[PDB]
Each structure stands twice: as C-alpha cells, then as structure tokens.
Design a protein around this ligand. Structure first.
Ligand SMILES: [Zn+2]
Lengths: 94, 364, 49, 61, 151
RNA sequence: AAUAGGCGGCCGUCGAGGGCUCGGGUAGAAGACCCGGUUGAUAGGGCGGGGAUGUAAGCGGGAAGGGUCAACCGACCCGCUUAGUCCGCCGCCCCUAAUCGCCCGAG
RNA sequence: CCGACACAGGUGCCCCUGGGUGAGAAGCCUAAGGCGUGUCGGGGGAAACCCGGCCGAGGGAACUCGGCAAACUGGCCCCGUAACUUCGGGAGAAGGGGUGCCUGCGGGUGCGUAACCCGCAGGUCGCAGUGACUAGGGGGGCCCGACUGUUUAAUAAAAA
RNA sequence: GUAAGGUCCGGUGGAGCCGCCGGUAUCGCGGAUCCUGCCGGGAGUAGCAGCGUAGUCGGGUGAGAAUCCCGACCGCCGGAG
RNA sequence: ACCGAUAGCGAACUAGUACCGUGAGGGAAAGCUGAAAAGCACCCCGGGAGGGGGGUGAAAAGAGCCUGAAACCGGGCGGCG
C-alpha cells in the first residue's frame, strides 16, 4: 500500500471508458474515472485532483480525452474531527 | 390460398429460452458393441483451415480441397466415480454410486511464489469448487467395501446399466480452477464388463487418444453464443415492412386474426436469442494432437497454435481435437462430443486423411 | 453576497464588457465588503479588480 | 392562422379606454364615444330596458 | 394531527414522537415503516443510514409498479427512498431523545409502534396542450412512532 | 409430473450451505448466469509476441529558379527509417487492487 | 408584451454590424459583446424497438397506384449547342476539356516595386485540387391554362 | 314490527327535545351521458429528449451545494442568442 | 302554520366584491374556540417547521379552534390465506 508521506506514479487507462459513454461526455467521464481509480488504488477516502491534470484531460475538447494518463499521487492522513483517520490523496501531473 | 410461402423459423426448437445449465447435457447415447467411454469433453480453442486430399465419396474425391477446422483443447479427464442404474416403474433410477477417496494431485501447475513453499494441492480441493460437500474421513477400506456391494448387486442382477462419472481438469491448461462434472455411458452388451472397465479406470486419467478414433464422425453438444434480446427480424427472419411504414419496419405486421380472440404461440415475437442448447450431427474428426503439436509425416511436427496465439484464447498446451467444420458455443466454452448417433450409409473411412497444409498464420 | 453589483460597476468604470473583468479569487471577502463606487475604484487601483 | 398566432397582434392601440363620465373602461377611443354610457355621443346616459347592467350597480334587480 | 393510534401507551416505560405535514411520498413512507416495524432503535437507525448511502435496498410489497429487481435474495422490487429515510431518521432521533429524557436506557429501546398517514394536500396546476390546466399536487405525510424499553 | 421423483455426500435434532460487498465477462434491459478472489495471473502496470496503417519529429544533401547569379528563400525529393503512432489480441513477472466487513440460515 | 404558462407561435428583426475565405448582409472559422437558464441530473457495449444521420459487395426500378424517399449533377474559365418560334426566345439546351501548391516573366488603370484585375512558361504531390463549406440532374411525346398574379386562415394551390 | 320503521343498552357531545289528538307542507332517492363538494384505481406511472445535446477542476458562503459566488480549462451565438 | 348557510335575495362576511371578455355584457366561493385568552410560563431536542415533558381549562374546545358522519388511507386485533 501507500503510507502517508511518499509519492507514487500511476498510469490511469482512461481508454477503458471511451466506448461505454456517448462521445460528448468522455472528458467528464474520464475525470470521474481518474478520481475513482486514484481513490481505489491509494485507499484514500478523499482525492484532490489538480487543475493542471484536469486541463490535461480537457486539452483536446470534451470528446477526445487522453487514452493513458501518467499521474503522481501523494497520500496524507488528516485525522480531522476525530472520525477515525481520513486519507487524502493529491494528484499531480506526471 | 393465394400466394404461399414456408413459415418463418422452426417450431421444433421452442421454447427459445436460456439453457438450463451452461454444462451441456446428453439425452441419448449411441448403441455400440466396443467397450469404451462414449464421448469426451473439451474447451473451444479456435478455428483455422487446412488443405487435404479428399477421401469421402463425391466428385471431389482424390483432389486437394479447402476445409475449415475448429481446434478444441482436451486435457485428460479424471475418472473418479461409478454410478449404477436399475429399472424403475417409469424409467431408469439411480441404484447407487461410489467415488474414490481423496488423493494427492500431481498435475497442478504450482509456482514457487516468494514466501511459503509450493501449495501441495490434492483432489477434493479442486472438486469442492463444484460439489462443495465431499465425504469426510473417507478411506480405502470403506471405498472398497462400497465397490464390493455394488458388484454384488450387479451379480444379483438388479443393475441394468452402469455409467462413469468424470471431471475436467482446467488447471492443467491454466484456464480456470473450478472443474466440471459429467457422467458418460459405456459401450458393450454386458453390465459386468462395463463395470470392470470403469473399475479398472477408477481414479485415473483418460485421454482422447484412448477413446476416440481418428477419422470417425461425431456429434457435438454445447451451448451457443449469447445474443441477448433480439427482435423478430433477427430471431425468426421475418420480412421487413414497407419503407413507407410510419410505425416501424422491424416488427410483425399482424399478430393474429379476429378469431381465435387470442394471440397464438406460433406468432414470431422478440425474446432471448443465443445461449441455447443445440446439437450438430456428423462432424468428422480430422486429427488428434498431443502436447500442442501435430505430427504430419513422422518427420515434421507443427505447433497448432497460430502465431500470436488464438484470439481471446491462450496457447494450446495439451491434447486437442481438430473437428471439420464449425461447432456451437463461444471461445473457452465447454463442448462435449459423442460418437455419431445417426451416421449416413456411406461415410468416410476411419483414418486420418492426407493433409497437405495447415494454417498457422496470425488469426488476429 | 453574489458578486454582481461590483462586477457591473467595475465594468462600467473600466469601459469594458463584464466578461472582461477579473476579480482576485483570494480577495472575495474584500470585494464583497466594498459597497460604493469609491470602494470599487479603490479596489481597481489596488489591483484586486 | 386564426388561432394562437393571431392573438400576438394585440399590441396596437387598445379599442377601449377609461370613460370620464361613467368611470368604466369602455370608451371607444378611435370613434369617440362610450360603449356603456354613451358619453361623447349623447347628453343622456345610455340606458336600455333589456340590460340589467345598470340595475346590478345598485342591487336593484 | 396530534393524536396517536396507539392504545395502551405507558408513560413510565414508553416514549413517543411524531412529525406532521412532511413533504415526502406517503407511499414510500408506508413502505419504509413496514420494514422498520419491530426493530430495535439502533438497528433501525443503521438501516436508515444504509438506505441513505444506497448500500441496502428497501423491498416494495404494495406500491411496486414498473420497478426493477435488485441483487440478492428477496428481491423482488426495491428502491432507495433517501428523503423518506432522512425524515424518518430525524423522527427516530427525536424519539430517542424523548426516551433518554424520561430516563430509559437507549440500548434497550424497541420500536413497538410506527405508522405513516396521508396528510393535507397542497394543490397546484401545470399547463398542458389544447388549453387545459391539470392538477399538480404535493401529498404530505404524517409519521408517528412509540418505542418501549424491553426487558 | 398433486403418484409434487432417484441417488452419493454434508449438516440439525452451535450450525452445513448461502446472500450483499471485491476484481472481470464464455452473460446481460432490472434480475439472472459464468470465471477469479492471497490454496491468486481476475483487472491494471512492466516486458516480450503477433497485428493496423505506412516511413514520424530533427538533422544532412538535392531541387524548377530567383537572388548583387553573393548570404539567404523555395513546392517537392532522397538517407538515418519496415520508421513513428496505436492496439476493445495473446504469453511471462504478484509491482498495485481482488481488502475490512454485514445479514439470512433447518432445528 | 399577446396567446390561461418562466408557451419552439406572434408582435419587433423596427434601426445598426470587426478579420479570413470568398461575387456576397451566403456557408464555415474567429475578434468584440453575451451566455452555459432554448435550466432536472447520474449509470451503461445496458438489450429489443422507435426517431435523426453515415456507409454498404453483385444487379440497377425487377419495388410501388405512381422512381414516394433517397441518389446523380452542382462554383468558375474555354470550346460547342437541336426541333420549334410570336425572331424576343428555346439556352446555363444537349455535350466536351481544364481547375491544387511552388519558382519566374508578360499585361491593363495607376506617379508607384501602393491597390485591384488579366495571361504566359517551368517544376511538383495525391485516389481525389469548386479537395472542407458553398454548389442545377438531363432529354423526348400528350392534355389543360397564354404569361407575372389570387384562392377555401384550420384536409382541396388546381385545369378554379 | 311481515315492512315502512319504533324503542332500549354502552360510548362521544354540551342545550335543547319528544308521545297523543286536530291542521298545514319547497314532506320520503339508485339512476335524468342529473347539479354542487369531497375522495379513489390508473400511479410513484407518463412527462421533465427531438428545433441551440455543456460542462469539468481547485477555492468560498452555508445546517444543508450537480444547480449560488470567484479563478482556469472546454464549449455555444457571433447580419444575431 | 315562510327558509335556516348547496336553503333564503346573486351577496348573513372587505358582494355586484374577486375574477372572465376588445365590447355590449357575465359574475363566484367564503358564518361558529372558550364563561373568561385564562391564547400554553419554564425544561430537552431540531437549521427551522415542529416534536416530547410540564402548565390552563368542567371539557383542548389550541386558533389548521362547536358537534365531527360517509367515501378514501395507515396501524392493531378476530377469521381465511
Ligand atoms: Zn362611459
């Protein structure tokens, strides 16, 4: 797994959702897929996606998101409000 | 009658419902004198084509012709049970059955993953994936005592038939771990001889080469590919409505007359298409391979697996059969074969024909 | 509050379309606090708008 | 035509406006008389026996 | 509405609460109450939390037209009435507080009676073709609950 | 199939056997069905095989000419280059996720 | 604003409109200005079927009351153009050839190597050069009414 | 009591009501595609598509945010929005 | 010896009022806490609406207020299933 503090590289395969959605929703579907993938793989209760990676996803318009996206994930523990410990992931380009 | 045409579709395959089980059943068996297991099971691998010198009767006899073939991989079956049938009031009834006790498994492809040694599988561990409730504290003494009781009933004469219960071994070809359990009838005219055959083969492995004969006809049983819900145009092949029709074109025009005041069961309708239990007759067995290789002239052997592997399927590693033509089912589907139950009067000789070319080029 | 009056007045003062007015995303509190045209001009001078 | 699209042309000068005499919005503006009390057409009020409107005013019907 | 349909309420051993004129579906309220009946208070609260989080379908036995089935045994039509679950959860918290104030152990509270009723309807209209105005109404719901400290 | 069946096994008089949840399709409108779930190659990632197009960007040279017949500009062509790009196909490697957990259940 | 409505109609499109391509206030792209309120969202190889589009081998109207729908042609330059005729026309009849980019010259008006337009030679790439957008299918008989125009607002646009 | 109907008991209600004789009447309800009011099944269903398919990521206010506000990205109209 | 709030004038009341049609003109629905507001002080919870205690009153008759039927809907109980 990933403990708080270190960073990892992931290769999100955005291509897996291109054909299950209409052509004009592919970009938001890819953003949602990236969020789900990062949360699942980092075991993070929350995910914070950088505007830079969002713009990378939206570069070629709403219809042509990149097939593969290489992202940098950094995990931290907040333990806020006393409701157990919440894991927050931060996603950045490359 | 004004204009007449044959009905759309066949009523002999109704209801067109999903198959009861994904493992095909065999309702009838061929009548034979040779004491052998009547059929075999395997997994669909793919299709290719060959060029051979035709030998069956016809104009193209002794000439080089093109023939498509379906390759199906057939890892050996494990004979692990024997079942006895008596005659009931309305039909055959199961008098009893007996299965061998647990034994170590010597063909499990275990790999030494870092940490812990090799798993050391044994039978009753792959079988519990299908049965899920197997005998506890089962020993050879009680197994032999049960076998003796079954033999004693056979001698008394209340047993009218005997069948062999076998299980597949997908783990050998690394397709899956859950096995599939079936029972096969045996040829011959003496229940005692059939029982002795099964007893000799109890707990052992059986290969296609020991049961099936190259060049003979077979019947193939499987569950066809699934297509989901389909409209009448594709399900029954009805005629499209006129292009000026403003209420659709892929639908039946009238679903019945005024009287009877009901919709008849013979009117084409939408519903499940595919994933049906079907049987195809008179499929010739071209060749039986071994270890994924085919011997052609005793000097050159070629690997049946095409370059890049079979599409949607792995690499053939065990014994396989090359059936002439097409077979129902999808890739990796379990397919059963039995000796032809209805062969023609004139049939090809029982021997491998002369093969001049085998297509092993990339199929994807 | 909804930054509508401030945006409209800033556009009027600067003589440009409202879509061409830029408000500092990290001084929303100050922009909302400004209520008069004098305050809006002061913010423009400071560079918040 | 003759239906919904026709009623969109009711943005011209209203046919009737308020009447200085009877206070009702019945003063034909283009012709110059009241369709209720006759203002601008006669000195005396427009009153008819087949009409109950002028009795409704004083609850005398 | 103020009165309850419970007969033998005992102020020494029982607590009660209600909500009136709730703007939710009375049908779904009835369906959820049918399932909540007879459960412990904590179990009912967890049930409602699962329904709100969409981790657990509510079966439909009376009002289930054109409703698809759900995975698992017993389904059969089911759905997730989030709004009804939220309102009923608030009512259950209120009754829990009433019991605690009376001095009843919250861990032994069993929902002995729970019911839903159709309250006043707020009328409205919507325009339709051919110059026709058609009813467009809201149906409000009353909820009543009384819990008992079991022993 | 109201004569609502036969057989081997497992459990009960705590408990076999399941459902939800997890990774995917030999399946699919909801349900249902099939394979996998650390007794692991189910999906992703890496590498290798096989494919579809058709030789990338960059650099070097030529080019009908023009230019002070100089510097430079120039459609296009040739070499590095079966290249570059991509893969809803296959093989090997536990590097990541198949986890934690919840509820029926005969008596 | 009127139409019962925060109505895809009508009133008011009543007056006005940067850049490229281009004959153009056409189509397409874009600056200014405006909007994300022609206001319910989420899921999915998640089907059948229905509406709106793109392509379909071989044949080419065998379909049908009837080529209904779709399809062919399509801009511009050059050559060439029938019966008939009221001599005006028919006529863009019909039919045929060309069209890109690049390197240099010649010409018209012009003070000009400003701006607009018109030809010429050579080299070169693609299946395709009005490459997208824009953008006629054609011909031959018969009946009726000379033509432009008007008509049953809400099933008849016609020979009336 | 054949009956139209009468009377009695238990409960709610809080100020009027009846037996008999003799008269009077807007004097007796199942229907009139009857009139007025209220409520049912259809149904948690259709509709919230078609003529311009537009949202996403960080931050903010707030009990509560797909729908409100600011920044970036991506889009629509651009002889009309 | 008239009716007693779907009756009686259309109007028992902010009724020839609201509202409909360009206009002539057409034209509704809607009465009642209690003897006295004594119209619920204080406490717990909820964002709030409200809920539960506790008070007032002969009686909540609690302003959504005299009595409170039928149709319809939710629950409990007895019988069938
Ligand atoms: Zn007047």
């Amino acid at each position: 797994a990933i403990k708080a503090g270190e960073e990892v590289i992931f290769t999100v395969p955005i291509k897996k959702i291109k054909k299950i959605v209409p052509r004009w929703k592919r970009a938001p579907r890819a953003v949602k897929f990236v969020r789900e993938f990062v949360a699942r793989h980092a075991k993070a209760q929350e995910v914070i996606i950088d505007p830079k990676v969002n713009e990378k996803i939206w570069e070629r318009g709403i219809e042509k998101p990149p097939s593969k996206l290489r992202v940098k994930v950094k995990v931290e523990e907040e333990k806020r409000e006393g409701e157990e410990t919440v894991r927050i992931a931060y996603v950045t380009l490359a | 009658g004004k204009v007449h045409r044959p009905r759309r579709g066949s009523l002999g395959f109704s209801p067109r419902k999903r198959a009861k089980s994904i493992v095909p059943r065999i309702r009838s068996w061929p009548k034979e004198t040779e004491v052998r297991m009547l059929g075999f099971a395997g997994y669909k691998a793919g299709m290719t084509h060959i060029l051979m010198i035709d030998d069956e009767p016809g104009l193209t006899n002794g000439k080089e012709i093109f023939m498509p073939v379906t390759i199906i991989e057939t890892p050996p079956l494990r004979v692990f049970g024997i079942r006895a049938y008596r005659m009931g009031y309305l039909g055959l009834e199961t008098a009893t059955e007996v299965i061998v006790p647990d034994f170590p498994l010597d063909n499990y492809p275990a790999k030494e993953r870092k940490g812990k040694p090799k798993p050391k599988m044994t039978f009753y561990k792959l079988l519990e994936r299908r049965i899920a409730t197997l005998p506890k504290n089962y020993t050879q003494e009680m197994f032999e005592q049960k076998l003796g009781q079954l033999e004693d009933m056979i001698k008394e004469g209340e047993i009218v038939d005997v069948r062999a219960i076998v299980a597949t071994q997908p783990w050998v070809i690394k397709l899956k771990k859950k096995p599939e359990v079936m029972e096969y009838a045996i040829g011959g005219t003496s229940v005692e001889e059939k029982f002795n055959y099964i007893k000799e083969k109890l707990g052992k492995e059986l290969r296609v080469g020991e049961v099936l004969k190259e060049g003979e006809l077979l019947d193939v049983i499987a569950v066809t590919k699934g297509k989901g819900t389909q409209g009448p145009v594709k399900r029954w092949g009805i005629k499209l409505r006129a292009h000026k029709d403003s209420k659709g074109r892929r639908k039946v025009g009238s679903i019945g007359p005024w009287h009877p005041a009901r919709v008849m069961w013979t009117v084409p309708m939408a519903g499940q298409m595919g994933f049906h239990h079907r049987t195809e007759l008179n499929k010739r067995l071209i060749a039986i391979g071994e270890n994924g290789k085919l011997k052609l002239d005793e000097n050159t052997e070629i690997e049946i697996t095409p370059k890049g592997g079979f599409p949607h399927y792995g690499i053939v590693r065990s014994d396989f059969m090359m059936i002439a033509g097409s077979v129902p089912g999808a890739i990796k589907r379990i397919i059963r074969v039995r000796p032809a139950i209805r062969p023609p009067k004139k049939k090809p000789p029982v021997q491998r024909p002369q093969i001049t070319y085998v297509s092993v080029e990339s199929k994807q | 509050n909804t930054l509508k009056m401030q945006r409209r007045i800033a556009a009027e003062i600067l003589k440009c379309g409202e879509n061409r007015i830029w408000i500092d995303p990290e001084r929303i509190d100050d922009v909302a606090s400004a209520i008069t045209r004098e305050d809006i001009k002061r913010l423009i001078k400071e560079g918040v708008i | 035509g003759s239906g919904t699209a026709t009623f969109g042309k009711r943005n011209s000068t209203p046919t009737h406006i308020r009447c200085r005499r009877c206070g009702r919005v019945s003063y034909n503006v283009k012709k110059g008389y009241c369709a209720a009390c006759g203002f601008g057409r006669s000195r005396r009020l427009r009153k008819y026996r087949w009409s109950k409107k002028w009795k409704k005013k004083k609850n005398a019907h | 509405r103020f009165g309850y349909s419970f007969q033998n309420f005992d102020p020494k051993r029982m607590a009660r609460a209600s909500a009136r004129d709730l703007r939710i579906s009375p049908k779904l309220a009835v369906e959820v109450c049918r399932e909540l009946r007879g459960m412990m208070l904590n179990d009912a609260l967890r049930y409602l939390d699962d329904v709100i989080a969409l981790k657990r379908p509510v079966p439909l036995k009376r009002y289930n037209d054109s409703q698809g089935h759900k995975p698992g045994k017993g389904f059969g039509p089911g759905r997730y009435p989030v709004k009804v679950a939220k309102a009923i959860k608030k009512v259950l918290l209120n009754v829990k507080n009433n019991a605690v104030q009376k001095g009843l152990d919250p861990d032994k509270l069993k929902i002995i009676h729970i019911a839903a009723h159709k309250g006043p309807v707020l009328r409205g209209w919507y325009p339709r073709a051919f110059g026709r105005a058609t009813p467009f109404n809201e149906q409000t719901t009353h909820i009543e609950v009384v819990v008992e400290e079991i022993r």
